[PDB]
Amino acid sequence: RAKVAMSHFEPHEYIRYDLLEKNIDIVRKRLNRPLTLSEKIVYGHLDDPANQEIERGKTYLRLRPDRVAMQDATAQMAMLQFISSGLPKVAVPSTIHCDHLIEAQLGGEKDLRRAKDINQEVYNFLATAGAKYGVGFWRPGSGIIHQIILENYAYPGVLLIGTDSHTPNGGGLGGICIGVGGADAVDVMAGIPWELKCPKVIGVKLTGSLSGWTSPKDVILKVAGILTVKGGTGAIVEYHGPGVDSISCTGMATICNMGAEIGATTSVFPYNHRMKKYLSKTGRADIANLADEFKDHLVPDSGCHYDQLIEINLSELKPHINGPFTPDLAHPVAEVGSVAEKEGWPLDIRVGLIGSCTNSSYEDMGRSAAVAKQALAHGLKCKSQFTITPGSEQIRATIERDGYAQVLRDVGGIVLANACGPCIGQWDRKDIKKGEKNTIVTSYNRNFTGRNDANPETHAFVTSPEIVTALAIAGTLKFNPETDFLTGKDGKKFKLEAPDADELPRAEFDPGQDTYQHPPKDSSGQRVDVSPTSQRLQLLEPFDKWDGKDLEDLQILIKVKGKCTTDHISAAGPWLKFRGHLDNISNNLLIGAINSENRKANSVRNAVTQEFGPVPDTARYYKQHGIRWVVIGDENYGEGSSREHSALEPRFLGGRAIITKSFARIHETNLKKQGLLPLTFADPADYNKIHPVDKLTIQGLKDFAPGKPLTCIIKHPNGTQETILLNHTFNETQIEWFRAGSALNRMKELQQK
Ligand code: SF4
Ligand SMILES: [O-]
């Protein structure tokens, strides 16, 4: 047996491709059919491969992940729940990355110094709880969670879970990396099996090769346009075909990253020589050599069956730019100017923003610098404001060293700290006023309303970093880098040629400053202090167990119209200040959702006072008076970012059930984890039978069972009653979470008490 360590920081934790192989072989003896690559890695990690029921789309798999990664906006509540479990140490390699609480304002070093003073209490809490429980800690300034994972922790065949919806990024290195809520990370840190509904597999066969201005980002901008934001739900997207070898390993991670915007469980590429190359240049040639010996297990079987196949010819793909509003409104760059003109979207670009974990590779930075040096060679600078977010300290130190950062400063860019910043709305943006209509273009991934600056009228478009750079120099959406001319300082018209740049540094990567803090797994006599008067951190009081009774005469808090993402439910931005304080963050509950009654945000009728007011204030009034309530939603409810606060906050303010036409995956799991009932209409037209004034009784909880629907009695004010049926996806493990009041309550019953 080979003894190759999982990373440079865990020299004693070895990669177990021997167990992966053994489990794949138990499973293919049972199934007698070819396995896709995602099937090999996922079934290769089952807790019990001989007995597990495997039906794509139907069974819940009990899995053993190799490691857990958390970022600091979700690590605080995952760790406060681990502290209530009472367990002494994490069971698997786990890390915390401090990337979400650094606000962009002054640029780089100045913003990091300010964040360290402002967020002291929280960074402290996380560093101490990390030292105490055996969790590795990447300090503020070190980089964004997915770039640090790609550079240090992802490898072919890993099963990794992360408390962030863009965890799929690590699929660019052939692993299965899945986004989860904080309570799912607590299961694995605690050592119990992790459950995942068996995925469907969408295959995307790539043919030809990219060339010119077309980059890896255009592949997933095209795929998002084809599948739409609800097309990937419950499936893994598995890229394959001869065109795969023409994409860099970091380009593969860009594509897997943005698969989060079509609702996919994750995305994955097969192990090939581009990944081998990246592993060797990031100090992990021993891992590339071991994966070469287990190569058969890290590619799909011949003839495996995909549930949907899409074919993309890379040689015909053109540059794309998606938005405004939703990531699946796809346009060629060649025609977004004309469409904008037509639709009334501002053509003048105020800000061009590149980088973040989706698009800060060395190759991305080099291609953007290659565009920028052509503008500089004609005496031009950006017309738009222009920001650059490096995804890690290693990338910042290396592009600084190889000269790209200076080219990007000379065209007018400001380099921001190695942190999410504008990508999750941590941006002190003052060039526009709130409600001023304007257009920004980014090389990020989500461009939903208010995501980047909390201004509903900002039209955000997502594209590749080299296209953001060319459009920031032109200053307008009415500019096509492939066809159009700019006028230099000197009066000559010139055309931008297609950027060419190296994939990886010729020299090695410069790691930059010391940013990792290993746990004393010696010492650990750390005491975690949470002040009882902190406004930022609060220990959890357990939720009530189920009373054994049906839910009668539930009040509707709000019937939501249309789209309701986790940012409508639990907004980010300034509310990130309270991600470790459940009572204070609950003051944002559902403030962005549209009430069907009046089509306004944050204005619902209080049933007792008959005043219209804020949703959190109304939910606290109902709670205070003993009125149990419900939310009614439309399709794909809870779409988006993974924040379990979206499920914790309604449980905390007295909600009992959320009834919708359908749920996004991570949010439905988070609702079940927190003791709420996520239920869907057995007939979606019944959404129209429920009016805001109706009261509901959910009956049948005594006989709650997998596959059996619950009965809902709609009680109309005129005395009419209508019965409808509601489906649920609970298996009996999950019904036990409901009966105990939460999954954490259940686990504590199992820990002998
Ligand atoms: S907020 Fe943006 S930069 Fe931060 S982890 Fe998510 S995708 Fe990456
Ligand atoms: O994310």
Give the whole-angstrom CA distance, residue 471 versus residue 352: 8
> Within 6 Å (CB) of ligand 2, which residues are found?
164-166
β-pairing, 655-660 vs 677-681, is parallel
Would the annotation count 423 as a binding residue?
yes
- From 71, 166, 451, the mutation candidate for ligand 1 (largest count of ligand atoms within 8 A of CB) is 166
**Span from the CA of 484 to the centroid of ligand 1 (angstroms):** 32
Would the annotation count 245 as a binding residue?
no
Give the whole-angstrom CA distance, residue 173 versus residue 253: 7
**Span from the CA of 514 to the centroid of ligand 1 (angstroms):** 22
Yes or no: say if 362 and 348 are a contact pair by the CB < 8 Å rule.
no
Assign 3-class secondary structure to 637-700: ECECCCCCHHHHHHHHCCEEEEEECCECHHHHHHHHHCCCEEEEECCHHHHHHCCCCCEEEEEC
Dihedral (Cα; 639, 642, 647, 652), 10-degree rounding:
-140
- CATH numeric code, 533-753: 3.20.19.10
CA-based R_g, the chain, Å: 25
At 223, the amino acid letter reads V
- Does ligand 1 come within 6 angstroms of the Cβ of 150? no
Yes or no: say if 153 and 237 are a contact pair by the CB < 8 Å rule.
no
- Does ligand 1 come within 6 angstroms of the Cβ of 360? no
Give the whole-angstrom CA distance, residue 188 versus residue 66: 9
Q: Comparing C-alpha atoms, which of 279, 221, 459, 440 is closest to residue 352?
A: 440
Which class for 498: exposed (0-12), middle (13-18), buried (19 or more C-beta within 10 A)?
middle
Q: Comparing C-alpha atoms, which of 623, 736, 580, 593 is closest to residue 672?
A: 736
Structure tokens at 647: 């499920």
- From 423, 442, 443, 579, the mutation candidate for ligand 1 (largest count of ligand atoms within 8 A of CB) is 423
Instruction: Give nearest CA residue, ligand 1 atom 6.
Output: 166
Q: In angstroms, what CA-CA distances link 444 with 418, 440, 560?
A: 14, 11, 28
**Span from the CA of 165 to the centroid of ligand 2 (angstroms):** 5
Alpha helices, DSSP H only, in 212-296?
Answer: 216-227, 249-258, 273-281, 285-293
User: The domain 202-314 belongs to what CATH superfamily?
Assistant: Aconitase, Domain 2 (3.40.1060.10)
Q: Catalytic annotation on 514? A: no
| CATH class name, domain 1-201 | alpha beta
According to DSSP, residue 421 is labeled G
State the CB neighbour count (10 A cutoff) for residue 125. 23
**Span from the CA of 450 to the centroid of ligand 1 (angstroms):** 15
According to DSSP, residue 540 is labeled P
- Does ligand 1 come within 6 angstroms of the Cβ of 426? no
Dihedral (Cα; 653, 656, 660, 666), 10-degree rounding:
70
* Solved using: X-ray
- Does ligand 1 come within 6 angstroms of the Cβ of 420? yes
Q: List the catalytic residue out of 66, 72, 164, 218.
A: 164
Yes or no: say if 274 and 247 are a contact pair by the CB < 8 Å rule.
yes
Instruction: Give nearest CA residue, ligand 2 atom 1.
Output: 166
* Cβ contacts of 136 within 8 Å, gap of 6 or more: 9, 10, 93, 94, 95, 96, 130, 516, 517, 518, 519
Structure tokens at 116: 């360290």
Yes or no: say if 166 and 257 are a contact pair by the CB < 8 Å rule.
yes
Q: Comparing C-alpha atoms, which of 246, 196, 180 is closest to residue 219?
A: 246
**Span from the CA of 416 to the centroid of ligand 1 (angstroms):** 14
Would the annotation count 249 as a binding residue?
no
Structure tokens at 623: 């709670």
State the CB neighbour count (10 A cutoff) for residue 293. 10
Length of the chain: 753
Q: Comparing C-alpha atoms, which of 114, 170, 179 is closest to residue 644?
A: 179
Structure tokens at 58: 């139907």
Yes or no: say if 190 and 330 are a contact pair by the CB < 8 Å rule.
no
Q: Comparing C-alpha atoms, which of 393, 418, 403 is closest to residue 513?
A: 393
Alpha helices, DSSP H only, in 322-431?
Answer: 333-343, 362-376, 393-401, 404-410
- Does ligand 1 come within 6 angstroms of the Cβ of 72? no
SS3 call for 29 = helix
Assign 3-class secondary structure to 130-169: HHHHCCEEECCCCECHHHHHHHHCCCCCCEEEECCCCHHH
Q: How far, rounded to the nearest angstrom, does the alpha carbon of residue 583 sit from its chain's CA centroid? A: 24
Give the whole-angstrom CA distance, residue 78 versus residue 73: 10
- Does ligand 1 come within 6 angstroms of the Cβ of 144? yes
* Cβ contacts of 706 within 8 Å, gap of 6 or more: 730, 731, 732, 735
Give the whole-angstrom CA distance, residue 370 versus residue 351: 20
Yes or no: say if 196 and 169 are a contact pair by the CB < 8 Å rule.
no
Structure tokens at 693: 């004034």
Q: Catalytic annotation on 446? A: yes
Would the annotation count 642 as a binding residue?
yes
315-489 with 533-753: one CATH topology? Answer: no
β-pairing, 235-240 vs 266-268, is parallel
**Span from the CA of 618 to the centroid of ligand 1 (angstroms):** 33
Yes or no: say if 233 and 664 are a contact pair by the CB < 8 Å rule.
yes
DSSP string, 486-536: EE-TTS-EEEPPPP---SS-SSPPP--S--EE---TTT--------TT-SS
Q: Output phi, psi for 686, to 5 deg.
A: -70, -10
Dihedral (Cα; 602, 661, 184, 82), 10-degree rounding:
40
Structure tokens at 373: 């040096």
At what resolution in Å was this solved? 2.0
Give the whole-angstrom CA distance, residue 559 versus residue 685: 14
- Give the torsion sign (CA, 225, 451, 169, 335): positive
Q: Comparing C-alpha atoms, which of 195, 260, 93 is closest to residue 735?
A: 195
Residues in a beta bridge with 559: 632
Structure tokens at 160: 């990794």
| Domain 315-489 part of CATH 2.40.50.100 | no
Structure tokens at 365: 């930075």
Q: Catalytic annotation on 662? A: no
Cis peptide bond N-terminal to 324, omega within 30: yes
At 139, the amino acid letter reads R
SS3 call for 104 = strand
β-pairing, 308-313 vs 200-207, is parallel
Burial of 155-193, coded b for 16+ CB within 10 Å and e otherwise, reads: bbbbbbbbbbbbbbbbbbbbbbbbbbbbbbbbbbbbebb
Yes or no: say if 339 and 235 are a contact pair by the CB < 8 Å rule.
no
β-pairing, 438-442 vs 349-355, is parallel
- What are the residue ranges spanned by the domains of the chain? 1-201, 202-314, 315-489, 533-753
**Span from the CA of 324 to the centroid of ligand 1 (angstroms):** 19
Q: List the catalytic residue out of 100, 139, 645, 651.
A: 100
Q: Catalytic annotation on 643? A: yes
| Half-sphere exposure at residue 469, Cβ-oriented, CA atoms within 13 angstroms | 35
- Does ligand 1 come within 6 angstroms of the Cβ of 145? yes
